[PDB]
Amino acid sequence: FRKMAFPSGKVEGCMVQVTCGTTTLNGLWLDDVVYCPRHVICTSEDMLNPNYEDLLIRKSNHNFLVQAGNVQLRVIGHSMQNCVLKLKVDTANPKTPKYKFVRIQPGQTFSVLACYNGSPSGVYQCAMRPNFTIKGSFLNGSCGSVGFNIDYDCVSFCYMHHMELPTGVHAGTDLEGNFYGPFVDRQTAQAAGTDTTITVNVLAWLYAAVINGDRWFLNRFTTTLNDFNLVAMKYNYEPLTQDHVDILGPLSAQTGIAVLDMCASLKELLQNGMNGRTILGSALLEDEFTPFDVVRQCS
Amino acid sequence: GFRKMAFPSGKVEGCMVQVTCGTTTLNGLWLDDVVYCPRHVICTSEDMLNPNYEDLLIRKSNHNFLVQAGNVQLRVIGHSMQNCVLKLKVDTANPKTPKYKFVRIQPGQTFSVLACYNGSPSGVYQCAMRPNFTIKGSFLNGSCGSVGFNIDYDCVSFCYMHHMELPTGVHAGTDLEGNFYGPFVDRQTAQAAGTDTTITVNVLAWLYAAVINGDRWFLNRFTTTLNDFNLVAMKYNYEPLTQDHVDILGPLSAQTGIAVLDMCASLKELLQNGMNGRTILGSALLEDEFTPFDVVRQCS
Numbered sequence: 001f002r003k004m005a006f007p008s009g010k011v012e013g014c015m016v017q018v019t020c021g022t023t024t025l026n027g028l029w030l031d032d033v034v035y036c037p038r039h040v041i042c043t044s045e046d047m048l049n050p051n052y053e054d055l056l057i058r059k060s061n062h063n064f065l066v067q068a069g070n071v072q073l074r075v076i077g078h079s080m081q082n083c084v085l086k087l088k089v090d091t092a093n094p095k096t097p098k099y100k101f102v103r104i105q106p107g108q109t110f111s112v113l114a115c116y117n118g119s120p121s122g123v124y125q126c127a128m129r130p131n132f133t134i135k136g137s138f139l140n141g142s143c144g145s146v147g148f149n150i151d152y153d154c155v156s157f158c159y160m161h162h163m164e165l166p167t168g169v170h171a172g173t174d175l176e177g178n179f180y181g182p183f184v185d186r187q188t189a190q191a192a193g194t195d196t197t198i199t200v201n202v203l204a205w206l207y208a209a210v211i212n213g214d215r216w217f218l219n220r221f222t223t224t225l226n227d228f229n230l231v232a233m234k235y236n237y238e239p240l241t242q243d244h245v246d247i248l249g250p251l252s253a254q255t256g257i258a259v260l261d262m263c264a265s266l267k268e269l270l271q272n273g274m275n276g277r278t279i280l281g282s283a284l285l286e287d288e289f290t291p292f293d294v295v296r297q298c299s
Numbered sequence: 300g301f302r303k304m305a306f307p308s309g310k311v312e313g314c315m316v317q318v319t320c321g322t323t324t325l326n327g328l329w330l331d332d333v334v335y336c337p338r339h340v341i342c343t344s345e346d347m348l349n350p351n352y353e354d355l356l357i358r359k360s361n362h363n364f365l366v367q368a369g370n371v372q373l374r375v376i377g378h379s380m381q382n383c384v385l386k387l388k389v390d391t392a393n394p395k396t397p398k399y400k401f402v403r404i405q406p407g408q409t410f411s412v413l414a415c416y417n418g419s420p421s422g423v424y425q426c427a428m429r430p431n432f433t434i435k436g437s438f439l440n441g442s443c444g445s446v447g448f449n450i451d452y453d454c455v456s457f458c459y460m461h462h463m464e465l466p467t468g469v470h471a472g473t474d475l476e477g478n479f480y481g482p483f484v485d486r487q488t489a490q491a492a493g494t495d496t497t498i499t500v501n502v503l504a505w506l507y508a509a510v511i512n513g514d515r516w517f518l519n520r521f522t523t524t525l526n527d528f529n530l531v532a533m534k535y536n537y538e539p540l541t542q543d544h545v546d547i548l549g550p551l552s553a554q555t556g557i558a559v560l561d562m563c564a565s566l567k568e569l570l571q572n573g574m575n576g577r578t579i580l581g582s583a584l585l586e587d588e589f590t591p592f593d594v595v596r597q598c599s
């Protein structure tokens with residue numbers, strides 16, 4: 001199994017750069033609006049403790065330089081929504097795809113198009129961790145890069161990049177400007193909380209192993225959801241939700257293995273270890289492939 | 300941070316089309332007024348067992364080829380064969396044609412794959428050309444004709460077109476001149492790859508990446524000569540390291556202050572002792588599909 005990103009072209013066609021003064025971030029151009037992190041309006045001195053409302057009231061449309069490549073896109077309106085700035089522009093992006101803005105849950109995966117000065121550099125798959133960070137790859141200049149999924153022809157934007165934490169993980173907002181996790185857009189010391197293992201994705205991985213004929217770990221027993229969740233937390237595994245049980249349904253139907261029976265197998269693995277064996281050629285249990293990712297790569 | 304990262308695929312997406320001959324549908328690459336695709340699109344299931352492609356192709360007419368770019372059929376007005384690739388001349392140029400070239404990559408080099416089904420892009424990921432000339436891709440039925448590429452400035456360098464999956468689950472294909480990487484043939488007959496080796500220069504690059512991201516338990520105070528390292532490498536079915544490789548690792552050596560031969564001494568220790576149940580950059584195995592250039596680009 002490979003981490004596989006969505007093809008990035010539909011998002012590449014929406015990337016722009018936004019400059020205030022000497023500060024250039026990436027923005028997302030959809031119809032006649034450009035979305036970007038509001039900290040583009042901050043000086044280094046503002047960043048230490050910014051008053052965004054005051055900073056913005058002193059800004060005018062003509063202070064914002066929006067460019068697609070080197071072609072300026074004139075700004076005709078501006079507003080702030082949580083931690084994102086929305087700049088109305090006088091040109092509708094002819095490459096706008098069908099799109100929506102979604103807020104994802106921990107454990108869900110998405111593709112990141114890393115961009116610098118509006119120019120795409122690379123694309124990779126990420127999982128939202130339970131502590132609301134992503135293990136991304138981002139350098140200075142990447143703020144405003146977005147994460148997304150593509151369903152049929154519709155791009156669901158779910159992430160806009162803002163922050164790199166001391167442990168080298170990343171934090172950001174949805175496209176309505178609300179941070180995932182407790183983070184704030186201020187240049188003050190912050191840290192990722194203790195992370196946990198994404199149980200629903202580990203289960204998806206076990207289902208993937210079964211689909212490929214690797215099934216030594218299946219046992220004759222079952223468990224209740226509550227008993228499993230209480231045990232899982234003692235191994236720093238996330239508890240399951242009803243939604244997790246639901247999204248495992250297709251894999252459960254494909255293999256004939258009830259979700260709670262697979263939970264009982266995973267519990268035995270947690271309690272007893274791998275005893276030197278591998279699953280899908282790995283001694284480690286993978287937790288960044290969702291049930292959707294598994295069906296998309298097996299079938 | 301450090302991720303396996305593919306090139307943005309947009310420039311290639313705008314070239315993907317669907318090609319159907321008989322009951323076989325796969326992908327084609329539409330550049331200017333030519334569509335490139337695997338020649339086995341012309342085979343029936345019976346032909347595939349032992350195809351005489353020149354004989355099979357002369358019996359085909361332009362109208363036997365259905366090319367579709369989205370909702371639009373493209374009229375085939377000419378066809379020819381170059382090794383294992385079929386070239387369909389069509390009556391309209393692709394306005395989305397990027398600046399491009401066709402290159403043949405060397406083992407150990409990386410490239411991005413745009414996996415496509417029925418002419419539609421489905422996913423993108425990074426692969427390396429293995430020393431045994433396979434690639435460890437993720438390809439299903441319908442993926443034939445998907446391509447691999449690198450991007451340099453605004454120029455797309457196409458290096459791979461997908462043809463086959465071997466019994467071990469690894470993959471095989473051609474350059475865009477239709478010549479296979481490796482000893483493989485486009486016939487439906489069981490085929491095995493030669494023994495593979497690990498791409499040593501890439502393992503070292505990835506160890507340098509691990510240091511840049513603060514993961515350095517595997518370092519040691521020792522050093523080694525290049526030849527003594529290579530003796531151990533070959534014993535463990537790792538490729539030998541050349542002085543060109545040492546030079547290419549230079550910037551990573553400069554960035555970290557770890558001499559290349561010192562990192563070789565660390566890798567020697569890992570080969571001889573294993574990882575003692577530890578991990579590097581989250582992996583329990585030594586990763587060899589990041590080139591030095593891949594690492595520098597990401598960690599600059």
Ligand SMILES: *[C@](O)(C(=O)NC1CC1)[C@H](C[C@@H]1CCNC1=O)NC(=O)[C@H](CC(C)C)NC(=O)OCC(C)(C)Sc1ccccc1
Nearest residue numbers: 039138139140141142143162163164165166185186188190
């Ligand atoms: C983003 O602002 C950006 O790319 N701006 C472009 C250059 C003008 C950067 C992206 C970061 C920089 C390095 N890698 C990245 O992904 N974002 C920021 O610099 C953050 C801006 C805030 C949100 C207003 N600031 C930031 O991430 O600082 C981290 C701290 C201070 C919150 S936590 C920390 C403390 C000590 C050491 C490391 C991290």
Ligand SMILES: *[C@](O)(C(=O)NC1CC1)[C@H](C[C@@H]1CCNC1=O)NC(=O)[C@H](CC(C)C)NC(=O)OCC(C)(C)Sc1ccccc1
Nearest residue numbers: 339438439440441442443462463464465466485488489490
């Ligand atoms: C390609 O032809 C394609 O996608 N065609 C579309 C569906 C009409 C496929 C791609 C393969 C299919 C499964 N995963 C893939 O990457 N290519 C082929 O089917 C090969 C066609 C040849 C080149 C004429 N055939 C093939 O890959 O078979 C493998 C063997 C027979 C060479 S080796 C083998 C033997 C036993 C078990 C597994 C593999």
